[PDB]
Amino acid sequence: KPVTLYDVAEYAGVSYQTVSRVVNQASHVSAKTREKVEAAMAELNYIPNRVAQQLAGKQSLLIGVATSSLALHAPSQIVAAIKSRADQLGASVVVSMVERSGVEACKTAVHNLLAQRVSGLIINYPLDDQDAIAVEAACTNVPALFLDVSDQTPINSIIFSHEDGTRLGVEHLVALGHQQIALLAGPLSSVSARLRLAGWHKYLTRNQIQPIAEREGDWSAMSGFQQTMQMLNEGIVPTAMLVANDQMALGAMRAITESGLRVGADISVVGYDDTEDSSCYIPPLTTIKQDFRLLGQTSVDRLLQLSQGQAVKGNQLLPVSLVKRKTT
Amino acid sequence: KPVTLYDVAEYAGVSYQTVSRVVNQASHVSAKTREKVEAAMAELNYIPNRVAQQLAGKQSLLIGVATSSLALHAPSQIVAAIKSRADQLGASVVVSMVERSGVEACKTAVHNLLAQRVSGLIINYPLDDQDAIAVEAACTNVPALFLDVSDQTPINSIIFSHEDGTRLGVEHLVALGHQQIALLAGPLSSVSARLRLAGWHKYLTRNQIQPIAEREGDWSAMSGFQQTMQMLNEGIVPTAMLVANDQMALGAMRAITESGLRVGADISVVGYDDTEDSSCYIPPLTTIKQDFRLLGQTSVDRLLQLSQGQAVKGNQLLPVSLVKRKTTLA
DNA sequence: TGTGAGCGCTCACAATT
DNA sequence: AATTGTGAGCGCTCACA
Numbered sequence: 263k264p265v266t267l268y269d270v271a272e273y274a275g276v277s278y279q280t281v282s283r284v285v286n287q288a289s290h291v292s293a294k295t296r297e298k299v300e301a302a303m304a305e306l307n308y309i310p311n312r313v314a315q316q317l318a319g320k321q322s323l324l325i326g327v328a329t330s331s332l333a334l335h336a337p338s339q340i341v342a343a344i345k346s347r348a349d350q351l352g353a354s355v356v357v358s359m360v361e362r363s364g365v366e367a368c369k370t371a372v373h374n375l376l377a378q379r380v381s382g383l384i385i386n387y388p389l390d391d392q393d394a395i396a397v398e399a400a401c402t403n404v405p406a407l408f409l410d411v412s413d414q415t416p417i418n419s420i421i422f423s424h425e426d427g428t429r430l431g432v433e434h435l436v437a438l439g440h441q442q443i444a445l446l447a448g449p450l451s452s453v454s455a456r457l458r459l460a461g462w463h464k465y466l467t468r469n470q471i472q473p474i475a476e477r478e479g480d481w482s483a484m485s486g487f488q489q490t491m492q493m494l495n496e497g498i499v500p501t502a503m504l505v506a507n508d509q510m511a512l513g514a515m516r517a518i519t520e521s522g523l524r525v526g527a528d529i530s531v532v533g534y535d536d537t538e539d540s541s542c543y544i545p546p547l548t549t550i551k552q553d554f555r556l557l558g559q560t561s562v563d564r565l566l567q568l569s570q571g572q573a574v575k576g577n578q579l580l581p582v583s584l585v586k587r588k589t590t
Numbered sequence: 591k592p593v594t595l596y597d598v599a600e601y602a603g604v605s606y607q608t609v610s611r612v613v614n615q616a617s618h619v620s621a622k623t624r625e626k627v628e629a630a631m632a633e634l635n636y637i638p639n640r641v642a643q644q645l646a647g648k649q650s651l652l653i654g655v656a657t658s659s660l661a662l663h664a665p666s667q668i669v670a671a672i673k674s675r676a677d678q679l680g681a682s683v684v685v686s687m688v689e690r691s692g693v694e695a696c697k698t699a700v701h702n703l704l705a706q707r708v709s710g711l712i713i714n715y716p717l718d719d720q721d722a723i724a725v726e727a728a729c730t731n732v733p734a735l736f737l738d739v740s741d742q743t744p745i746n747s748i749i750f751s752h753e754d755g756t757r758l759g760v761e762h763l764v765a766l767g768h769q770q771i772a773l774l775a776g777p778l779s780s781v782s783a784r785l786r787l788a789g790w791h792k793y794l795t796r797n798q799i800q801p802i803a804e805r806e807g808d809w810s811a812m813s814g815f816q817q818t819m820q821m822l823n824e825g826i827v828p829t830a831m832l833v834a835n836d837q838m839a840l841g842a843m844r845a846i847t848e849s850g851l852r853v854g855a856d857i858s859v860v861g862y863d864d865t866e867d868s869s870c871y872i873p874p875l876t877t878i879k880q881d882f883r884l885l886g887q888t889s890v891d892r893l894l895q896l897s898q899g900q901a902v903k904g905n906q907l908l909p910v911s912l913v914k915r916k917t918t919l920a
Numbered sequence: 921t922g923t924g925a926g927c928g929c930t931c932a933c934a935a936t937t
Numbered sequence: 938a939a940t941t942g943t944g945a946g947c948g949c950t951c952a953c954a
């Protein structure tokens with residue numbers, strides 16, 4: 263049985279409360295008293311049983327996070343910025359990873375997070391409107407913030423402005439004089455993917471352009487490669503491609519190149535994310551920058567505000583920007 | 591105040607213990623009684639406060655994980671396979687991410703994980719031998735498994751066989767007839783990086799070869815690009831490069847290509863990891879495969895065995911393999 | 921500074937029938 | 938002999954003293 267707060271009480275000549283104050287950096291200590299207590303716990307290697315502290319009522323803002331597999335780029339980047347910002351605010355973070363596809367899986371995840379009595383949830387998992395509303399409802403009394411829902415979902419959410427991203431992309435290709443444009447989208451089961459797809463159609467339409475092709479990948483470079491290969495093998499050869507993410511763009515670029523065409527000069531390409539690696543593709547990839555650090559930082563700040571009944575309900579849009587490189 | 595075990599007690603006509611039995615799938619229930627209780631908690635949307643269950647003494651296997659930033663490839667892949675395998679074993683997982691560089695930071699992380707009374711720790715953070723031994727010592731009574739230490743560290747650990755990876759790389763370049771070989775290593779502050787560096791030197795030496803260059807990156811493709819550019823600008827132009835990871839290899843390939851040289855035909859390249867993207871680099875990257883799923887899966891199984899006083903102490907080496915692609919062709 | 925109380929549950933028994 | 942209750946406590950935080 264690990265050292266208790268009681269064990270330090272006698273090994274310091276004080277009570278369990280005296281030690282408590284010391285541990286909590288409380289106000290009103292016997293000055294030199296704290297010096298003695300700390301030495302007492304130091305020699306016994308005392309580590310406050312957080313499990314007991316929480317139950318006892320210690321107000322510790324504990325953020326829960328239901329997320330897509332961390333094996334995926336953006337999710338990992340986001341959780342990272344979340345834990346980082348939470349540590350910086352003295353907030354704790356427990357995360358439930360959802361691997362199985364489906365709303366039940368996400369609900370299971372929210373269930374456990376709730377069991378750990380989190381003071382708020384951050385759901386970074388693709389959810390259709392009613393499913394999101396359902397999840398939001400299951401969050402018994404605790405606030406929920408969503409990161410993978412449409413801007414049209416009636417719940418608290420933060421997402422990058424797909425409107426701005428897709429416009430930037432389309433307008434860039436247009437200003438370069440492209441008219442034969444193909445679209446490589448993320449998996450349709452992804453809300454974010456769908457939002458980008460919609461964004462492209464919206465702005466391509468406003469420029470009286472109709473994509474000469476439209477395929478669906480799964481976020482992986484291999485899918486980008488295969489999809490762009492099938493497209494080219496069907497004789498459909500555009501002069502520019504808008505791709506849902508940098509990784510698929512990479513695969514597209516491989517297919518283009520292994521076909522005898524020059525990325526840029528023959529078929530321009532635009533990616534999405536502006537991942538670290540994108541600046542070193544052959545040739546450097548023009549892309550839309552999504553500052554994941556900012557999303558994770560903002561997510562935590564926001565979930566805390568909500569937890570404090572602060573009037574900041576709704577949907578928030580994060581800025582993005584065009585990074586001009588050599589693929590266009 | 592969320593629904594208590596007490597709330598179900600009267601909303602079912604039983605006591606808190608009766609409900610407890612039903613919740614824990616206990617032995618000796620009133621048969622139909624459990625049928626009633628379950629219905630009672632179902633209608634009240636009851637979710638057992640795990641915090642209270644743990645304190646009360648409920649024996650649950652909770653794995654703690656101190657790790658390098660999840661913003662890095664391998665660590666994120668590893669934590670994912672860890673959480674995945676733990677969920678599959680009905681084990682819970684809490685993870686403390688260490689961002690600040692240093693042993694104190696890692697100790698801080700272990701401190702918190704201990705505060706949550708985990709039944710074991712998985713440290714995936716670069717630790718020199720004495721620092722690792724120190725951390726291991728701080729793990730008051732609970733078993734610790736390390737993933738970023740040397741195979742020579744006297745503690746429980748699991749790492750990929752750098753010996754096999756570097757040999758595979760070196761022997762491959764040699765069989766292709768390369769003699770002018772440059773080395774691009776990961777950051778020296780990384781144990782894993784150093785192990786690979788050592789491995790290359792070891793096997794290059796056994797083939798009577800001396801690298802004509804040896805630079806250090808930081809795992810990022812940009813570092814791979816910059817380092818390989820400085821190297822080429824100094825007039826040092828090898829015929830093959832061994833790179834500590836696929837991302838730096840990417841940067842190297844960019845530098846090689848933007849220099850008028852053909853990756854493969856003029857300067858061969860070998861990476862490390864066999865990341866998903868590596869199969870789609872221009873041209874496809876020959877690399878050393880490190881099965882991160884396997885590492886995370888094995889780590890959990892192993893930490894649990896240790897937790898059960900199973901005699902499996904020491905260091906374990908995981909296999910790796912060479913993935914031949916196009917960067918070492920012609 | 922001490923004291924009382926409790927957080928939600930698990931134990932260990934006891935207590936029902 | 939089945940089933941239920943009862944007592945106690947887990948480690949700490951509160952509220953007071």
Ligand SMILES: C[C@H]1O[C@@H](Oc2ccccc2[N+](=O)[O-])[C@H](O)[C@@H](O)[C@H]1O
Nearest residue numbers: 334335336409410454481507535552
């Ligand atoms: C920043 C956005 O990134 C999307 O990121 C995704 C998700 C998985 C793999 C790659 C990408 N991507 O963009 O390249 C998320 O689905 C969305 O919920 C939001 O987190």
Ligand SMILES: C[C@H]1O[C@@H](Oc2ccccc2[N+](=O)[O-])[C@H](O)[C@@H](O)[C@H]1O
Nearest residue numbers: 662663664737738782809835863880
């Ligand atoms: C599988 C191995 O990967 C190494 O991975 C690293 C670590 C950070 C960024 C990239 C890589 N990498 O290999 O490309 C770890 O340092 C080592 O502890 C172990 O986890």
